[PDB]
């Protein structure tokens, strides 16, 4: 919108707090504008908080509005570039008054060079791309900017006064330098970039994005009267009777406490505001704005010396101001407000009314809340200017009349995102009924983004909704059984689930049209069970405070905290110790010395160790740690597992140690705790020849096909290998068990980053060194600075200890599940239906995992049913005591066919019934008479 405004080189001026290297960060402060009009396109005047200039291929004056003899301003000076570069002063051509700084700071004029200053809430920064200069000044406030320009610039010279705050996101490269940025108020997509600190955010649903609302402040509610004025200001209270005056519910003026004197008040005046009559006070603001608590008001009138009175000593929460010099003698009036807990606030300008139907946040009788406010019509009690039904705040009176408050419904949108141009806004609250959107309560609340479909989720805008069709790939599920798809234009669909098909066949009698499956398929159901975490040995004496001794004689006052923490970490550590020991006591099994060879099962090149196997090494390669850190160094040392060195990190009091048998160092089926790949399927009585005869005997056992030849086993073999070589082609998403190990890794990494940010950050204390706090502050105010961060490192450490404890309690009962899963599904063959896997169970291997164990349950879900007829058995004669027959290890079957046949219990390969597959018994139940004699001897 302008001729020459450099946007690429704003990033030379942004700075985070402390050297954050290679990830993003949001930082709030006074920062220059997006607007192409606010830069010039040459004396400039404007109001704001700070300013910023650059120069392409400057005598800047900053002052308050009302200037007196003793104020503070600045002006920066330039003449002709490199010849006379820059002088900076803080004074009033006339060096008449207080001059704080005389600093050159000579800059380099280049093709690109941006700098500026800020003074937002008196945090006066004077920034330059090498260095900043920070100040805070108590009696300072700057509101006026007098920019001036040189006579001629080659391109357009440029200047910007900044009006309000900004909260910009910042990326930063390997050297800590900023190189990309995005203001949060420029658009909509960068609003949620500023929400979750990521710059090019991937598609997905992003929950709980807020809407900033303006505020309203109601310290008093009832309509407010006046007060008696300043007292008589008579002689002293001992020689003659004198009275102080009270102030409870007055609309004060704070300038009728004096005689007008025609502008002759030097001390009460602010450099912008007028007459705060409290020129020095203890424990509270000199600046009086808004409403202050009630006070009784002493007054004195005494003599002085040459225009220079001395403030008296005063109670620690009373407040002093004086006036009335400039009458050709050295007498004056002084006063003391004391602010003693009257509860009736005293202030000018009683509050008018909240405009109804707007969702602005409030504060009424020292209770902030955030809703929309309507009038009401039921007049509750004459106490209680705001009431509560249960826990909610539902009815407030404001200025005599009752105002009912309902919750703001539009404050949270969950944006679901594809790219910049296409997204959809979902409000999880706020239904949109057509009688409600057109309501009179809602005239001032609505936006263009509220004309959406009222869903069961909420209101979704700028997206389609149709639940009649389903989808199965719930990549980013949304809730309530709904899923958002991100293929084309964004939409909301109803997610579904693949069906189950129980393997409990029912016992057959009284012949019926039983359907049997015609063929199965293998299904691998990988199942991660978290089973280890690194055992810890914390030392709270040297975590909560370092080598400083002044902590350690003060730390044992805090309720026996340190002995409880170290005894608890030892106690939970020895629970984990004994319980991982009981886990490996039921892993270490008794495989034979025969070690039966396989023929077509590639099980030795996937599941057996090479010193870890080719599945869990490939599994560790699929896991992405969030960033470099202490857990990143721990995990990436434990990932590649380079021999004959350690990675047990110690940092400032917390020694991590590996547990009694760490899972992700040892291979599963190798080493000392060998897990016996054979001893599951080959049974406790070994001697069975190969995996091929083992699998044929298995398929006979679970009743798919008896006496299975090479064709059925090799078909199951090609199924096995082509479905466990598919352990490489699954990513983190759409996996459901790589999401579990990534959830364990992210939980563990976020825990240690909490545990390190607790020791880095001062918790509002002046530093993190206890000596520096001790050698700087008071005898007692250093105590309240000590117990601000020793009580914060206490909370960070105890938060870690309770996270460690609850995950130990989870792992105790999970190891009961893991033990009952290994030596009942991996080592035996379970009769239980869904315990091993889905349906008919074949084989179940287990491998190691990060912080856990993961099972490979191979199963046989059937897919193609064929409906047949099924008797228990066949008779030829109606007589009790006839020759009757039943099937041997199978079911009798007819495919709507004239005669009966034999088929296994769980699969349909029909055979003519012979002497081999038929047991002759009895007339027990009502078997089916086929009314013809047998064809079998």
Ligand X SMILES: *[C@@H]1O[C@H](CO)[C@@H](O)[C@H](O)[C@H]1NC(C)=O
User: What residues line the site for ligand X (CB under 6 A)?
Assistant: 1, 21-22, 34-37, 69, 89, 95, 99, 102, 174, 223, 236, 253, 255-256, 266, 305-306, 348, 389, 399, 419-422, 437, 449, 451, 462, 465-466, 468, 472-473, 498, 510-511, 513, 519, 521, 602, 718, 721-722, 725, 734, 863-864, 866-868, 878, 895-896, 899, 912, 926, 928-929, 931
Whichever of 75 and 763 has its CB closer to ligand X, that residue is 75
* Residue 393 engages a copy of itself in binding (rule: CB under 8 A): yes
Residue 488 site contact among ligand X, a copy of itself, none (CB < 5 to 8 Å, cut-off depends on kind): none
Residue 639 site contact among a copy of itself, ligand X, none (CB < 5 to 8 Å, cut-off depends on kind): none
Residue 420 site contact among a copy of itself, ligand X, none (CB < 5 to 8 Å, cut-off depends on kind): ligand X
- List the one residue from 1, 93, 130, 937 that touches a copy of itself (CB under 8 A): 130
Q: Do 551 and 631 form a contact (C-beta atoms < 8 A)?
A: no
Q: How far apart are CA 655 and CA 536, in angstroms?
A: 6
* Residue 84 engages a copy of itself in binding (rule: CB under 8 A): no
* Residue 466 engages a copy of itself in binding (rule: CB under 8 A): no
Interaction residues for a copy of itself, span 162-191 (CB under 8 A)? 174-177
Residue 221 site contact among ligand X, a copy of itself, none (CB < 5 to 8 Å, cut-off depends on kind): a copy of itself
- List the one residue from 260, 488, 687, 937 that touches a copy of itself (CB under 8 A): 687
90: which residues sit within 8 A by CB, 6+ positions away? 72, 73, 74, 98, 99, 100, 101
Interaction residues for a copy of itself, span 512-571 (CB under 8 A)? 512-516, 546-547, 555-561, 563-565, 567-569, 571
* Residue 229 engages a copy of itself in binding (rule: CB under 8 A): no
* Residue 93 engages a copy of itself in binding (rule: CB under 8 A): no
Closest distance to ligand X from the beta carbon of 469 (Å) = 9
Whichever of 57 and 499 has its CB closer to ligand X, that residue is 499
Q: How far apart are CA 691 and CA 676, in angstroms?
A: 14
Q: Do 254 and 295 form a contact (C-beta atoms < 8 A)?
A: no
Whichever of 83 and 174 has its CB closer to ligand X, that residue is 174
Q: Do 27 and 168 form a contact (C-beta atoms < 8 A)?
A: yes
Whichever of 95 and 898 has its CB closer to a copy of itself, that residue is 95
* Inter-helix orientation angle 630-640/738-760, to 10°: 140
Please give the backbone phi and psi of residue 8, each rounded to the nearest 5 degrees, phi first: -70, -25
- Taking residues 691 to 730 in sequence order and writing x for each that binds a copy of itself by CB under 8 A, - otherwise, the string is xxxxx-x--xx----xx-----xx--xx-xx--xx-----
Q: How far apart are CA 201 and CA 190, in angstroms?
A: 10
* Residue 381 engages a copy of itself in binding (rule: CB under 8 A): yes
586: which residues sit within 8 A by CB, 6+ positions away? 819, 822, 823
Please give the backbone phi and psi of residue 804, each rounded to the nearest 5 degrees, phi first: -65, -40
Considering only the stretches 55-63, 634-642, 804-812, 850-858, report the one whose residues sit in contact with a copy of itself under the rule CB under 8 A.
804-812
Residue 47 site contact among ligand X, a copy of itself, none (CB < 5 to 8 Å, cut-off depends on kind): none
Considering only the stretches 59-67, 157-165, 240-248, 349-357, report the one whose residues sit in contact with a copy of itself under the rule CB under 8 A.
240-248
Residue 863 site contact among a copy of itself, ligand X, none (CB < 5 to 8 Å, cut-off depends on kind): ligand X
Residue 521 site contact among ligand X, a copy of itself, none (CB < 5 to 8 Å, cut-off depends on kind): ligand X
3-state SS string over 754-770?
A: HHHHHHHCCCCCCCCCH
Closest distance to a copy of itself from the beta carbon of 80 (Å) = 26
Q: Do 878 and 872 form a contact (C-beta atoms < 8 A)?
A: no
Whichever of 672 and 731 has its CB closer to a copy of itself, that residue is 672
Interaction residues for a copy of itself, span 188-227 (CB under 8 A)? 207-208, 210, 212-219, 221-223
Sheet of 650-651: strands edge to edge? 535-538, 654-657, 650-651
* Residue 364 engages a copy of itself in binding (rule: CB under 8 A): yes
Q: How far apart are CA 372 and CA 747, in angstroms?
A: 38
* Residue 922 engages a copy of itself in binding (rule: CB under 8 A): no
Closest distance to ligand X from the beta carbon of 551 (Å) = 32
Residue 34 site contact among ligand X, a copy of itself, none (CB < 5 to 8 Å, cut-off depends on kind): ligand X
Residue 272 site contact among ligand X, a copy of itself, none (CB < 5 to 8 Å, cut-off depends on kind): none
Closest distance to ligand X from the beta carbon of 378 (Å) = 8
Structure tokens at 177: 């330098």
Please give the backbone phi and psi of residue 680, each rounded to the nearest 5 degrees, phi first: -75, -60
- List the one residue from 679, 741, 845, 846 that touches a copy of itself (CB under 8 A): 679
Q: How far apart are CA 765 and CA 130, in angstroms?
A: 28
* b/e 438-472 (16+ beta carbons within 10 angstroms → b): eeeebeebeeeebebbbbebbbbbbbebeeeeeee
Rg (CA), the chain: 40
* Residue 361 engages a copy of itself in binding (rule: CB under 8 A): yes
Q: How far apart are CA 185 and CA 206, in angstroms?
A: 18
Closest distance to a copy of itself from the beta carbon of 834 (Å) = 3
- Within 10 A of 270 (CB to CB), how many other CB atoms are there? 17
User: In 3D, which of 898, 889, 880 has the Cα closest to residue 935?
Assistant: 898
Closest distance to a copy of itself from the beta carbon of 459 (Å) = 8
* Residue 446 engages a copy of itself in binding (rule: CB under 8 A): no
Q: How far apart are CA 735 and CA 619, in angstroms?
A: 12
Return the residue nearest ligand X (CB atom): 35
Q: How far apart are CA 623 and CA 744, in angstroms?
A: 11
Whichever of 48 and 573 has its CB closer to a copy of itself, that residue is 573
Closest distance to ligand X from the beta carbon of 550 (Å) = 28
- Within 10 A of 192 (CB to CB), how many other CB atoms are there? 17
Whichever of 451 and 757 has its CB closer to ligand X, that residue is 451
Q: How far apart are CA 708 and CA 462, in angstroms?
A: 59
Binding-site size for a copy of itself (CB under 8 A) equals 325
Q: How far apart are CA 692 and CA 694, in angstroms?
A: 5
* Residue 272 engages a copy of itself in binding (rule: CB under 8 A): no
Closest distance to a copy of itself from the beta carbon of 532 (Å) = 16
Please give the backbone phi and psi of residue 486, each rounded to the nearest 5 degrees, phi first: -120, 40
Closest distance to a copy of itself from the beta carbon of 287 (Å) = 7
Q: Do 136 and 124 form a contact (C-beta atoms < 8 A)?
A: yes
Whichever of 227 and 446 has its CB closer to a copy of itself, that residue is 227
* Residue 581 engages a copy of itself in binding (rule: CB under 8 A): yes
Whichever of 44 and 658 has its CB closer to a copy of itself, that residue is 658
Q: How far apart are CA 170 and CA 180, in angstroms?
A: 6
Helix (H) or strand (E) holding 551: helix 549-552
Whichever of 154 and 343 has its CB closer to a copy of itself, that residue is 343
Whichever of 105 and 317 has its CB closer to ligand X, that residue is 105
User: In 3D, which of 284, 293, 288 has the Cα closest to residue 274?
Assistant: 288
Structure tokens at 663: 């899972």
User: Distance between the two ends of the chain, CA-based, in angstroms?
Assistant: 102
Chain breaks in the chain following residues, C–N > 2.5 Å = 41, 57, 92, 610
Whichever of 609 and 653 has its CB closer to a copy of itself, that residue is 653
* Residue 40 engages a copy of itself in binding (rule: CB under 8 A): no
3-state SS string over 349-377?
A: CCCCCCCCCCCCEEEECCCEEEEEEEECC
Considering only the stretches 1-9, 147-155, 350-358, 666-674, report the one whose residues sit in contact with a copy of itself under the rule CB under 8 A.
666-674
Q: Look up tokens 């994005």; give the residue.
A: 209
Q: How far apart are CA 336 and CA 298, in angstroms?
A: 5
């Amino acid at each position: 919108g302008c001729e020459s405004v450099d946007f690429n080189l704003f990033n030379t001026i942004f700075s985070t707090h402390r050297g954050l290297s290679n990830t993003t960060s949001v930082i709030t402060g006074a920062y220059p504008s997006t607007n192409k009009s606010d830069w010039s396109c040459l004396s400039g005047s404007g109001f704001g908080i700070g300013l910023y200039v650059q120069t392409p291929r400057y005598t800047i004056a900053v002052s308050p509005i009302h200037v007196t003899n003793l104020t503070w301003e600045l002006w920066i000076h330039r003449k002709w570039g490199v010849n006379s570069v820059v002088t900076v002063r803080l004074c009033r051509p006339t060096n008449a008054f207080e001059c704080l700084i005389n600093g050159s700071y000579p800059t380099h004029r280049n093709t690109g060079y941006m700098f500026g200053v800020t003074w937002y809430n008196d945090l006066v920064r004077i920034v330059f791309p090498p260095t900043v200069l920070e100040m805070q000044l108590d009696g300072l406030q700057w509101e006026r900017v007098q920019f001036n320009s040189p006579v001629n610039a080659g391109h357009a010279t440029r200047f910007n006064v900044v009006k309000d705050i900004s909260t910009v996101l910042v990326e930063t490269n390997s050297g800590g330098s900023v190189f990309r940025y995005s203001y949060c108020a420029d658009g909509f997509v960068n609003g949620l970039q500023c929400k979750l600190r990521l710059f090019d955010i991937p598609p997905g649903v992003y929950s709980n994005s807020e809407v900033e609302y303006p505020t309203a402040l109601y310290t008093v509610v009832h309509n407010m009267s006046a007060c008696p004025e300043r007292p008589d200001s008579y002689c002293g209270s001992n020689s003659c009777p004198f009275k102080r005056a009270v102030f409870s519910n007055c609309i004060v003026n704070y300038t009728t406490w004096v005689n007008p004197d025609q502008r002759d008040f030097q001390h009460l005046i602010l450099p912008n505001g007028k007459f705060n009559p409290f020129t020095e006070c203890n424990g509270l603001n000199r600046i009086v704005d808004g409403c202050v608590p009630g006070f009784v008001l002493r007054v004195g009138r005494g003599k002085a010396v040459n225009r220079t009175i001395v403030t008296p000593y005063l109670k620690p929460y009373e407040c002093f101001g004086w006036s009335w010099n400039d009458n050709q003698d050295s007498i004056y009036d002084w006063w003391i407000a004391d602010f003693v807990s009257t509860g009736a606030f005293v202030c000018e300008s009683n509050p008018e009314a909240p405009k109804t139907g707007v969702c602005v946040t409030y504060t009424v009788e020292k209770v902030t809340f955030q809703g929309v406010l309507y009038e009401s019509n039921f007049t509750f009690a004459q106490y209680y200017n705001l009431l509560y039904v249960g826990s909610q705040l539902r009815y407030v009176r404001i200025l005599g009349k009752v105002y009912e408050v309902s919750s703001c419904f539009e404050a949270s949108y969950d944006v679901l995102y594809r790219n910049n141009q296409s997204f959809g806004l979902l409000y999880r609250s706020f239904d949109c009924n057509q009688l409600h959107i057109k309501s009179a309560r809602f005239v001032d609340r609505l936006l263009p983004s509220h004309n959406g479909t009222a869903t069961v989720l909420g209101c979704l805008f700028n997206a389609s909704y149709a639940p009649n069709d389903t989808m199965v790939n719930c990549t980013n599920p949304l809730g309530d059984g709904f899923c958002a798809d991100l293929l084309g234009n964004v939409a909301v669909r109803r997610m579904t689930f693949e069906k189950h098909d129980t393997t409990y066949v029912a016992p057959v009698t009284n012949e019926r049209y039983t359907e049997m499956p015609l063929d199965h398929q293998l299904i691998l159901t990988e199942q991660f069970l978290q089973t280890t975490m690194p055992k810890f040995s914390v030392s709270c004496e040297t975590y909560i405070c370092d080598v400083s001794k002044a902590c350690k004689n003060l730390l044992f006052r805090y309720g026996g905290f340190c002995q409880k923490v170290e005894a608890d970490i030892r106690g939970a550590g020895i629970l984990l110790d004994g319980d991982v020991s009981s886990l490996y006591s039921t892993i270490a099994a008794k495989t034979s010395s025969v070690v039966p060879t396989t023929d077509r099962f590639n099980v030795s090149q996937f599941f057996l160790p090479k010193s870890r196997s080719a599945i869990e090494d490939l599994l560790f390669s699929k896991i992405e740690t969030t960033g470099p850190g202490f857990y990143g160094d721990y995990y990436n040392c434990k990932k590649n597992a380079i021999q004959d060195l350690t990675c047990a990190q110690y940092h400032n009091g917390i020694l991590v140690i590996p547990p009694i048998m760490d899972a992700e160092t040892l291979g599963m089926y190798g080493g000392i705790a060998a897990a016996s790949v054979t001893l599951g399927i080959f049974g406790g009585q070994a001697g069975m020849a190969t995996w091929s005869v083992a699998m044929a005997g298995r398929l006979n056992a679970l009743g798919v096909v008896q006496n299975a030849l090479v064709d059925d086993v090799n078909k199951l073999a090609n199924g096995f290998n082509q479905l466990t070589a598919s352990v490489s082609k699954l990513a983190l998403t759409t996996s459901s068990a790589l999401q579990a190990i990534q959830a364990v890794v992210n939980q563990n990494a976020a825990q240690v980053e909490s545990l390190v940010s607790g020791i880095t950050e001062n918790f509002g204390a002046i530093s993190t060194n206890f000596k520096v706090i001790s050698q700087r502050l008071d005898k007692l105010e250093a105590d309240v600075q000590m117990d601000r961060l020793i009580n914060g490192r206490m909370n960070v450490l105890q938060l870690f200890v309770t996270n460690y404890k609850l995950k130990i309690a989870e792992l105790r009962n999970t190891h009961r599940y893991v033990q009952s899963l290994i030596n009942e599904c991996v080592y035996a063959q379970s009769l239980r239906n869904g315990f091993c896997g889905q349906g008919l169970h074949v084989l179940s291997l287990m491998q190691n995992a990060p912080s856990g164990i993961m099972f490979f349950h191979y199963s046989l879900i059937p897919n193609n049913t064929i409906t047949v007829k099924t008797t228990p058995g066949l008779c030829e004669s109606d007589e009790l005591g006839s020759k009757c027959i039943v099937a041997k290890d199978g079911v009798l079957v007819s495919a709507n066919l004239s005669y009966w046949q034999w088929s296994p219990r769980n699969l349909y390969k029909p055979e003519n019934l012979t002497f081999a597959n038929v047991i002759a018994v009895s007339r027990g139940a009502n078997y089916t008479t086929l009314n013809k004699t047998f064809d079998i001897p």
